[PDB]
Design a protein around this ligand. Structure first.
Ligand SMILES: [Zn+2]
Lengths: 12, 266
């Protein structure tokens, strides 16, 4: 697995 | 005080200048409040411009987002003041006889934009200012002597009862005709004709127009030149010229550098 982060639009 | 007399003690004082406007820029938008938007969360914040510097937020304001480097500038949602630069030439009244006139660039803002136009002789009251200028745009490095300009805060250039009473007179035609040039000995039908030319006819929509046109001939060494000068002084927006050549003013419209110039007739 690759070190990564989920960036989310619903908190706009 | 003279434009030629300014010196570095003035560099923050409120001064007064007189001179001639050569030209002005179009209005230059000057940013007063930057408008930033977050790329991730679309939150927006306004930042006042301080001393000409954008105080960019390094991280998004919202603590529930707080992403770094994610704010971006939305140029056409910023708030802009109006700036204009005007070039003011030293008036020939003040110059020493053996050298060129100086000039000073002046910055003028908001509703003081377009207070004057090319050819206007004016006064200005303004703070004398100076700022450094760069050696090259890709570097911070500044030249060791500053541009000077004046940052202006004020600018200035350089009835019916009697009308109806006089309009009742019977001798009015002769009275007004003699009054156009009473220094000139009697040529009274010429004076009457030129008065009627000053009044003029009427226009109509459909072209037929209100212009009246007059010519004086006969011997050269006589009052006709003075007569032209007097009507020129009387008329609100007329001109004086002669039939050929151009001492930087000529009769016909003319294409030159590319620009169209309007002649004395126009
Ligand atoms: Zn954000």
């Amino acid at each position: 697995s690759f070190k990564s982060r989920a960036l989310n639009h619903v908190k706009k | 005080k003279g434009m030629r007399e300014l010196n570095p003690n003035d560099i923050d004082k409120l001064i007064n200048l007189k001179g001639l406007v050569l030209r002005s820029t179009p209005v230059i938008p000057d940013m007063k409040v930057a408008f930033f938007k977050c790329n991730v969360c679309d939150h927006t914040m306004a930042v006042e411009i301080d001393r000409g510097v954008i105080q960019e937020p390094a991280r998004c304001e919202r603590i529930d987002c707080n992403e770094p480097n994610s704010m971006s500038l939305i140029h056409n949602r910023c708030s802009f003041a109006d700036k204009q630069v005007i070039k003011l030439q030293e008036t020939p009244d003040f110059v020493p006889d053996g050298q060129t006139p100086h000039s000073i660039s002046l910055c003028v803002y908001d509703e003081l934009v377009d207070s004057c136009r090319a050819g206007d002789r004016i006064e200005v009251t303004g703070t004398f200012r100076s700022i450094p200028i760069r050696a090259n745009s890709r570097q911070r490095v500044l030249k060791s002597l500053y541009k000077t300009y004046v940052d202006v805060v004020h600018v200035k250039k350089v009835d019916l009862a009697k009308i109806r009473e006089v309009a009742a007179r019977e001798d009015l035609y002769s009275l007004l005709a003699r009054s156009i040039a009473p220094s000139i000995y009697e040529l009274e039908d010429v004076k009457k004709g030129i008065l009627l030319q000053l009044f003029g006819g009427t226009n109509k929509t459909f072209r037929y127009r209100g212009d009246i046109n007059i010519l004086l001939c006969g011997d050269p060494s006589t009052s006709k030149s003075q007569i032209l000068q007097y009507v020129h002084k009387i008329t609100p927006r007329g001109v004086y010229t002669s039939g050929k050549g151009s001492s930087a003013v000529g009769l016909t419209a003319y294409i030159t550098r590319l620009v169209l110039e309007s002649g004395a007739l126009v």
